Amino acid sequence: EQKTLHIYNWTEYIAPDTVANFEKETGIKVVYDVFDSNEVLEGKLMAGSTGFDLVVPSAYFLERQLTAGVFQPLDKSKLPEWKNLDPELLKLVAKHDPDNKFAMPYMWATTGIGYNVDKVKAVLGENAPVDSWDLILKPENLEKLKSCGVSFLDDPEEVFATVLNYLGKDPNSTKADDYTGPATDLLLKLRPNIRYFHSSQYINDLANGDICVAIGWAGDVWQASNRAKEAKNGVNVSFSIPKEGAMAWFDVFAMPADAKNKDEAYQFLNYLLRPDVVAHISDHVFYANANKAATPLVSAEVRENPGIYPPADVRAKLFTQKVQDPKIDRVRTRAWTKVKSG
Ligand SMILES: [Cl-]
Known part of the structure; x- marks a missing residue:
């Protein structure tokens, strides 16, 4: 029993x-x-x-x-x-x-931007656009943030959808050329300023001050922020669901x-x-x-x-992932290898 x-x-x-x-x-x-x-x-x-x-x-x-x-x-x-x-x-x-x-x-939760409040403000000013994907998807901003450390997730499904939404396209576009064309174009412009693509290193790196901006999962970023507070290390980590929307899951x-x-x-x-x-x-x-x-x-x-x-106005801007044809899956994998190679 x-x-x-x-x-x-x-x-x-x-x-x-x-x-x-x-x-x-x-x-x-x-x-x-x-x-x-x-x-x-x-x-x-x-x-x-x-x-x-x-x-x-x-x-x-x-x-x-x-x-x-x-x-x-x-x-x-x-x-x-x-x-x-x-x-x-x-x-x-x-x-x-x-x-x-x-x-x-x-x-x-959502896939948004985790960031070091003080380092971002030192580099981009008090009015840094922390409420926008512009913070990390405008090349001019990412060039300035490079030295304090930029991380992206190693997930083309989440990252391509985020970039497509930012470009004004269907976040779940079924058109292969959207991925191989404009989305890859932007990612290749950003690439030289990205320190790494990884699914989890950004959590501790945010908490310890080693990276200043990351694409990240909300709750894992809030965990990092709490870990920094508990460590009394002076690192101030925050997270943003940007105004253009973001992936919910x-x-x-x-x-x-x-x-x-x-x-x-x-x-x-x-x-x-x-x-x-x-x-x-x-x-x-x-x-x-x-x-x-x-x-x-x-x-x-x-x-x-x-x-x-998030409240109703923010939830209305969130999108969820749709299943694609396997042809698009393979497009995304191939394009992701190209992005990361640079
Ligand atoms: Cl999901």
Whole structure:
């Protein structure tokens, strides 16, 4: 009569005592495993027989697998606190997961600009355009910021979509020439001023003062900012969702089709739906959760931060990723190699 539950989630994406609290309440043995690379997660899910009862993919990946039999539909009768989830956010996630059949939204954020407040102002002045992609996508600005250090993500899907939106095009353009032409043109003009393309080095580099501007995931940047504060190192890190808009994305809990410990998994999911549980997570990880009942319980410093919980005018400028034809996938990979070579 041992009860067990196997979970696979991102690093830095739960509160330190969430699992311990759940174990004390339920008597379930939780085996909590972490990944730091989306490629690692998706490769395991596609191979199957992962041994996980719960996993945390992107809503975008879930869309790609809706007919592949990777996941199983969630039994809402075992999730009595489902009503706490924000219907407005559920509708957006339903673009990827019709009728919210497979996924329980967990946390969500944007891809924006993380930056060192003091260094940016030293280089570009007090009126530096921190509210705009101009800060890092105007070559004249990036040339000045080069010495204090510029990082881009190593993700052509996010970066091309960001550049296309900045150029006034469909962020999800289906036209190959938009990628190989104007988007690559701008990226090649910026390239000489970019120190590196990497998925995670920018977090600690922002916190320690080694880079001054980065394309980054909001909550990871806010984590860096908090780490700098705790270190009492004088580094002031902030984050901007720029005025031209930005990519929004949603991390979700889902259940592999071969999950064994289904009752325990639903217990954990409904535990996450308790307002104080997920509010406590957001307090620790600096990400907005999808639970509207939880918002008033989140610490004021987090819920009042419009780069974590953006208001309606900002949300209306955000775009989400669409699935492309594989021809466009290959275009993006080829063009990204060209960009990075310079
Ligand atoms: Cl997503």
